Motif scaffolding. Structure first.
Motif, mmCIF file in Angstrom:
data_model
loop_
_atom_site.group_PDB
_atom_site.id
_atom_site.type_symbol
_atom_site.label_atom_id
_atom_site.label_comp_id
_atom_site.label_asym_id
_atom_site.label_seq_id
_atom_site.Cartn_x
_atom_site.Cartn_y
_atom_site.Cartn_z
ATOM 1 N N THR A 67 0.773 -1.313 -0.073
ATOM 2 C CA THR A 67 -0.084 -0.327 0.100
ATOM 3 C C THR A 67 0.375 0.940 -0.370
ATOM 4 O OG1 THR A 67 -1.938 -1.045 0.981
ATOM 5 C CG2 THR A 67 -1.720 1.034 0.712
ATOM 6 N N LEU A 116 -8.632 1.982 -3.342
ATOM 7 C CA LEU A 116 -6.767 0.826 -3.521
ATOM 8 C C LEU A 116 -6.479 0.175 -2.612
ATOM 9 C CD1 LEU A 116 -3.865 1.505 -5.737
ATOM 10 C CD2 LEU A 116 -3.936 3.400 -2.927
ATOM 11 N N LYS A 127 12.607 -6.207 -3.201
ATOM 12 C CA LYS A 127 11.225 -4.411 -3.641
ATOM 13 C C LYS A 127 12.448 -3.999 -5.419
ATOM 14 C CE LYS A 127 6.884 -2.768 -4.155
ATOM 15 N NZ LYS A 127 5.823 -3.152 -4.180
ATOM 16 N N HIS A 132 -1.438 -6.573 -9.541
ATOM 17 C CA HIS A 132 -2.303 -5.121 -9.275
ATOM 18 C C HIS A 132 -0.868 -4.988 -8.799
ATOM 19 C CE1 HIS A 132 -6.769 -7.568 -7.839
ATOM 20 N NE2 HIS A 132 -6.368 -7.369 -9.137
ATOM 21 N N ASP A 191 4.746 -2.608 -11.269
ATOM 22 C CA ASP A 191 5.617 -3.057 -11.313
ATOM 23 C C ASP A 191 6.400 -2.773 -12.815
ATOM 24 O OD1 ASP A 191 5.958 -3.047 -8.727
ATOM 25 O OD2 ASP A 191 5.977 -5.305 -8.442
HETATM 26 C C1 LIG Z 1 -5.217 -10.198 -4.807
HETATM 27 C C2 LIG Z 1 -4.341 -8.762 -4.090
HETATM 28 O O1 LIG Z 1 -4.630 -8.519 -3.185
HETATM 29 N N1 LIG Z 1 -4.180 -7.308 -4.392
HETATM 30 C C3 LIG Z 1 -3.807 -6.585 -4.039
HETATM 31 C C4 LIG Z 1 -4.153 -4.696 -4.524
HETATM 32 O O2 LIG Z 1 -5.702 -5.158 -5.024
HETATM 33 C C5 LIG Z 1 -4.239 -3.686 -3.289
HETATM 34 O O3 LIG Z 1 -4.526 -2.558 -3.590
HETATM 35 C C6 LIG Z 1 -2.631 -3.748 -3.091
HETATM 36 C C7 LIG Z 1 -2.553 -3.587 -1.528
HETATM 37 O O4 LIG Z 1 -1.800 -2.832 -1.097
HETATM 38 S S1 LIG Z 1 -1.708 -5.454 -3.106
HETATM 39 C C8 LIG Z 1 -2.161 -6.342 -3.694
HETATM 40 O O5 LIG Z 1 -1.119 -6.500 -5.375
HETATM 41 P P1 LIG Z 1 -0.865 -7.616 -5.793
HETATM 42 O O6 LIG Z 1 -0.396 -7.762 -7.560
HETATM 43 O O7 LIG Z 1 -2.076 -8.526 -5.793
HETATM 44 O O8 LIG Z 1 0.688 -7.758 -5.200
HETATM 45 P P2 LIG Z 1 0.654 -9.268 -3.731
HETATM 46 O O9 LIG Z 1 -0.089 -8.548 -2.830
HETATM 47 O O10 LIG Z 1 0.475 -10.313 -3.994
HETATM 48 O O11 LIG Z 1 2.272 -8.627 -2.968
HETATM 49 C C9 LIG Z 1 3.403 -8.608 -3.402
HETATM 50 C C10 LIG Z 1 4.799 -7.437 -3.124
HETATM 51 O O12 LIG Z 1 5.477 -8.513 -3.340
HETATM 52 C C11 LIG Z 1 6.278 -7.352 -4.026
HETATM 53 N N2 LIG Z 1 7.201 -8.737 -5.172
HETATM 54 C C12 LIG Z 1 7.452 -9.352 -5.890
HETATM 55 C C13 LIG Z 1 7.597 -10.527 -6.134
HETATM 56 C C14 LIG Z 1 8.864 -10.516 -6.008
HETATM 57 O O13 LIG Z 1 10.427 -11.102 -6.060
HETATM 58 N N3 LIG Z 1 9.350 -9.266 -4.632
HETATM 59 C C15 LIG Z 1 8.677 -8.976 -4.283
HETATM 60 O O14 LIG Z 1 9.293 -7.930 -3.675
HETATM 61 C C16 LIG Z 1 5.382 -7.195 -4.937
HETATM 62 O O15 LIG Z 1 6.311 -5.691 -5.568
HETATM 63 C C17 LIG Z 1 4.345 -6.468 -4.487
HETATM 64 O O16 LIG Z 1 4.910 -5.162 -3.010
#
Ligand SMILES: CC(=O)N[C@@H]1[C@@H](O)[C@H](O)[C@@H](CO)S[C@@H]1OP(=O)(O)OP(=O)(O)OC[C@H]1O[C@@H](n2ccc(=O)[nH]c2=O)[C@H](O)[C@@H]1O
Lengths: 5, 695
Positions: free
Chosen positions: B246, B339, B566, B588, B593
């Motif tokens: 977030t 969000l 990250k 998302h 990314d």
């Molecule tokens: C389905 C769902 O929950 N959706 C949510 C959204 O709707 C919300 O708006 C978001 C809340 O702020 S989070 C969420 O977005 P998502 O795509 O699901 O990512 P998720 O929750 O799996 O995290 C992966 C993280 O690992 C990081 N990441 C990933 C791979 C890696 O190798 N290293 C890494 O740091 C990535 O940069 C990410 O930071």
């Protein structure tokens, strides 16, 4: 570090 | 039986959501019969639900003291410890419950759950199997197991699992009991939009029930801007002001807000994790309030009322750290989803969902409980321009005789390094410098092949892109901008120097049988090429490899890399040619990314908000040619991008430029548009109407 239920 | 009748009533008053009355009754039961183990333990569970965790523990131990073999008290105490972060105490309790009674299915399911949360998916699967074996009608265990299997891409009996999940949910909604499918996951399963919305509604309803114990009147909401010197007070509520996606999206927003018209309050639901993300939102918001300090939801909601918030923005939805109880208490006249949550809240306490025409089309407004509030381009944003400005430009090394994505250099001081070199060719696209194969070129490639951390050429620091955590751990997290020149290559990730690289960097759960079938179809059509996935988690790799062998593919065609820090994750997307987006649930944050690396992304928007985000990004970016209306179109776009090399060069060029020219990554512009919409929402209310769709 991710979005989770 | 006087005691029993109180306890049984209390049990029903609890299933009903009447929490205050359940408590009164269990206490009355213990007044009448002090040595009543089950009433101690039941009172403990409802105290646990209310957040009174020490008090709960005390009753669980009383219950165990009265009946030392009361496995259910140990099991539920386990959960209380897990909620206190005492993982060791949780395990000591769960395992003690299973020792007392190995056929106790609830204990097995709870143990499975703490296995899953700890990163031990094979043990969570085993333990949910044990639970389902002991009690075959057990919705929570079945659906939670269906998620573990999703995570590692185990699709054994996929089609029957899916319809089994739907009938469980139908059956749970018939009886108006809490669905065992979590709302956040409901986009993964072929449920009706009605069911998804109802799942959400029922989870929002838990919050309404927990706040009724407080007995709060409706708050009185300011009807004009007059006591806030003509500024719209906006309140951003999040558990994620720190090292979290977030903040990777919106950390610049607060400080870009126009302080003549807006006053910004960030309400953190989490404590300070020490990271720059946190530091920046705290520095740049007009006010920052640590609600994690104020656990009581009524007292916390009071602060929000007294701050004067006009618009209260829910950035959690049904994610971890949520305190939607805050929004159920309505401390503000306008309450919007933004969000962080990719779905509908389903709750009456939310007025809008900030979204957009491509993500949430007019037709499917029945998908959502909230009224649609359109941003003009996409609702999605990314702080990549601020975080990774060393990726704005790149150069390459020419290994034979020219590729944009084989050996790549990025750096704040790259122009100066280049100008230090005898022969450098510019190639128009605006432009990409090419370092021909000099002595200088060879020194670099050697550092890589040798696994060296860094070398120095002409006074410039040249860093191995694999070693960023050793050089500067804050630059690897995206907290600092790297201060060296970084080298990135296909060689580092075992990718072929001479073929097309399709990528997807999402957690593996977003992949389903159909999706991998399409990927297989694409790779068979484009010989040589490979598909570049992550170990996310690693134990999903053999499942994916095996289902692809079965589909046609030889083994060497899918290459797995580890999850990276990250900045390396975003930097390495540069080495790919194309990204294949998951249609079930799109990248998302992951979509932003890949686009920031200049990598085009092929997508097939579905119905769900979650399956249409990448299409909104690409629309905003202006690359409509990457959006497919069906599966054949997706494979043809992707195969076209892997064979028509000139069209690939054109499409790449467009993404590369349009990530700067388009609004996609333009936080100032996004913020100003967000402002218009907030004011739209405010007008329509001060002129005493209530929420309606804004388009
Ligand atoms: C389905 C769902 O929950 N959706 C949510 C959204 O709707 C919300 O708006 C978001 C809340 O702020 S989070 C969420 O977005 P998502 O795509 O699901 O990512 P998720 O929750 O799996 O995290 C992966 C993280 O690992 C990081 N990441 C990933 C791979 C890696 O190798 N290293 C890494 O740091 C990535 O940069 C990410 O930071």
């Amino acid at each position: 570090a991710v979005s989770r239920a | 039986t006087h005691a029993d009748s109180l306890n049984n009533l209390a049990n029903i008053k609890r299933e009903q959501g009447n929490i205050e009355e359940a408590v009164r009754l269990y206490r009355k039961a213990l007044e009448v019969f002090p040595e009543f183990a089950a009433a101690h333990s039941n009172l403990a569970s409802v105290l646990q639900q209310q957040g009174k965790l020490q008090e709960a523990l005390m009753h669980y131990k009383e219950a165990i003291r009265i009946s030392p073999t009361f496995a259910d008290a140990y099991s539920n105490m386990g959960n209380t410890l897990k909620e206190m972060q005492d993982v060791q105490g949780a395990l000591q309790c769960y395992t003690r419950a299973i020792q007392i009674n190995p056929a106790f299915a609830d204990a097995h399911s709870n143990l499975a759950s703490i296995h899953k949360d700890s990163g031990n998916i094979p043990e969570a699967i085993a333990s949910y199997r044990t639970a389902l074996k002991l009690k075959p009608d057990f919705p929570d265990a079945y659906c939670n197991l269906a998620h573990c299997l999703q995570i590692v891409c185990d699709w054994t009996d996929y089609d029957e699992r899916m319809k089994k999940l739907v009938s469980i949910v139908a059956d749970q909604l018939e009886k108006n009991r809490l669905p065992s499918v979590h709302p956040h996951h409901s986009m993964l399963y072929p449920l009706s939009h009605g069911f998804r919305k109802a799942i959400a509604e029922r989870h929002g309803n838990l919050c309404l029930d927990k706040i009724n114990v407080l007995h709060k009147p409706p708050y009185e909401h300011p009807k004009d801007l007059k006591l806030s010197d003509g500024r719209l007070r906006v309140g951003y509520v999040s558990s994620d002001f720190g090292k979290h996606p977030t903040s990777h999206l919106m950390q610049s927003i607060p400080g870009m807000h126009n302080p003549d018209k807006f006053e910004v309050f960030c309400y953190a639901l989490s404590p300070d994790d020490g990271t720059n993300f946190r530091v920046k939102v705290m520095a740049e918001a007009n006010h920052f309030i640590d609600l994690s300090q104020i656990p009581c939801n009524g007292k916390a909601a009071d602060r929000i009322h007294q701050d004067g918030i006009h618009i209260l923005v829910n950035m959690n939805g049904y994610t971890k750290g949520a305190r939607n109880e805050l929004f159920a208490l309505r401390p503000a006249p306008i309450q919007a989803m933004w969000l962080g949550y990719p779905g509908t809240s389903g709750a009456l306490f939310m007025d809008y969902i900030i979204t957009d025409q491509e993500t949430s089309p007019a037709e499917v407004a029945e998908q959502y409980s909230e009224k649609l509030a359109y941003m003009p381009h996409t609702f999605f944003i990314g702080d990549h321009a601020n975080m990774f400005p060393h990726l704005k430009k790149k150069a390459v090394i020419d290994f034979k005789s020219i590729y944009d994505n084989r050996i790549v250099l990025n750096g704040i001081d790259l122009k100066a390094f280049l100008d230090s070199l005898p022969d450098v060719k510019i190639v128009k696209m605006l432009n990409m410098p090419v370092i021909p194969m000099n002595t200088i070129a060879e020194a670099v490639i050697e550092m890589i092949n040798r696994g060296q951390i860094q070398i120095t050429i002409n006074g410039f620091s040249i860093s191995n892109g694999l070693a960023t955590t050793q050089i500067n751990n804050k630059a690897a997290t995206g907290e600092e901008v790297p201060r060296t020149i970084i080298v990135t290559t296909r060689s580092q990730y075992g990718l072929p120097e001479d073929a097309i690289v399709y990528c997807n960097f999402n957690q593996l759960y977003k992949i389903d049988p159909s999706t991998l079938q399409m990927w297989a179809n694409i790779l068979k059509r484009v010989p040589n090429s490979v598909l570049w996935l992550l170990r996310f988690p690693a134990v999903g790799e053999p499942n994916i490899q095996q289902y692809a062998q079965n589909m046609g593919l030889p083994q060497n065609r899918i290459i797995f890399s580890p999850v990276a820090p990250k900045e390396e994750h975003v930097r390495r997307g540069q080495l790919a040619d194309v990204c294949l987006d998951t249609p079930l649930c799109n990248g998302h944050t992951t979509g932003m990314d890949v686009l920031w690396a200049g990598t085009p992304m092929v997508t097939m928007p579905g119905e769900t908000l979650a399956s249409r985000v990448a299409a909104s990004q690409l629309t905003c970016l202006g690359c409509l040619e990457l959006i497919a209306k069906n599966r054949q179109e997706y494979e043809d776009i992707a195969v076209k991008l892997g064979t028509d090399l000139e069209y690939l060069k054109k499409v790449r060029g467009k993404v590369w430029k349009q990530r700067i020219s388009s609004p996609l990554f333009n936080t100032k512009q996004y913020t100003m548009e967000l402002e218009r919409l907030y004011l739209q929402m405010w007008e329509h209310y001060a002129a005493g109407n209530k929420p309606d769709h804004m388009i």
